[PDB]
XYZ file of C-alpha atoms in Angstrom:
87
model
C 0.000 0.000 0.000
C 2.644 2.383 -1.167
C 0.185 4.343 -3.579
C -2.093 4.392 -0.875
C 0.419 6.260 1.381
C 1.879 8.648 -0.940
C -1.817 9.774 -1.841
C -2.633 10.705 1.620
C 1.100 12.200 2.214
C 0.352 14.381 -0.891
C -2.365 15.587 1.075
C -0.863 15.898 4.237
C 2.019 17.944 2.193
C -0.508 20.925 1.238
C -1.212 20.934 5.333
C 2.447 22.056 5.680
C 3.023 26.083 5.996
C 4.136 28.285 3.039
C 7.045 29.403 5.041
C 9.286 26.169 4.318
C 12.744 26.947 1.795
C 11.791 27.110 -1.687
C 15.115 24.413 -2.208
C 12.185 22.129 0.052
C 8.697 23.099 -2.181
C 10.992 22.191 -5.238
C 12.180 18.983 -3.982
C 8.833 18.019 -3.384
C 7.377 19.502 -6.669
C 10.047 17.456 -9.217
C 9.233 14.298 -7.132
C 5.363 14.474 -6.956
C 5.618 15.087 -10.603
C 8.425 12.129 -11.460
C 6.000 9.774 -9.235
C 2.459 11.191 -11.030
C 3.884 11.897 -14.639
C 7.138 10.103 -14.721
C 9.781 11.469 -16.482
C 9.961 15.084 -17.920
C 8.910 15.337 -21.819
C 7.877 19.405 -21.828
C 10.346 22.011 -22.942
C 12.732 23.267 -20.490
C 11.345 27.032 -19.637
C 13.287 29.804 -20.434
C 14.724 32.771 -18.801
C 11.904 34.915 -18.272
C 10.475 32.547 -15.754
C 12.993 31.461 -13.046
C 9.978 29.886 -10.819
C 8.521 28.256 -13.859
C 12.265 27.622 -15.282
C 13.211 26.339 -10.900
C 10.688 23.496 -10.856
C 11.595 21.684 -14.668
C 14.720 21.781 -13.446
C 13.608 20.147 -9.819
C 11.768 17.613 -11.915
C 14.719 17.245 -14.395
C 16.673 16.539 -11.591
C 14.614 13.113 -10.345
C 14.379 11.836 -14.248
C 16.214 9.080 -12.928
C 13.803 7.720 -10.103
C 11.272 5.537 -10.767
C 7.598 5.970 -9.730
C 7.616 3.741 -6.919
C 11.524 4.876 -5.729
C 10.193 9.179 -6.550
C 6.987 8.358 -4.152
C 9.209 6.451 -1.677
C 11.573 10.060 -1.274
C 8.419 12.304 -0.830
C 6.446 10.451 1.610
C 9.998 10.897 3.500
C 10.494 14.181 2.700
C 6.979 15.335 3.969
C 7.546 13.277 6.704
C 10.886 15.686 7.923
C 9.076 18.682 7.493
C 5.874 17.474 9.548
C 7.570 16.255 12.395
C 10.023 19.417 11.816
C 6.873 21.619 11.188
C 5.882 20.500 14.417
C 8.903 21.955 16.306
């Protein structure tokens, strides 16, 4: 029940406050997308748009993981940042 896990973390994730580093949102960002979409196919933004331009290149950055190994990361990673949210 990995899937089933990751769902509700996903959830749990939007729970956590808007204060947390960016380098954290984008972590989180290129691996919900690697575990949802799998591996970037979309045009890497240009330089107009750092924030657009940021997350490709968060996402770019997990291309290797697979679904199951990307999910595995960001239930962890949420988990940090609850139990450090809650400090």
């Amino acid at each position: 029940g990995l899937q089933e896990e990751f769902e509700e973390f996903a959830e749990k994730a939007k729970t956590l406050p808007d204060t947390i580093s960016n380098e954290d949102k984008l972590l989180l960002y290129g691996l919900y997308k690697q575990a949802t979409v799998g591996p970037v196919t979309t045009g890497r933004p240009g330089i107009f748009n750092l924030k657009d331009r940021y997350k490709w290149d968060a996402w770019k950055a997990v291309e290797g993981k697979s679904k199951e190994e990307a999910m595995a990361d960001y239930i962890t990673k949420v988990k940090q940042l609850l139990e450090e949210a809650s400090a």
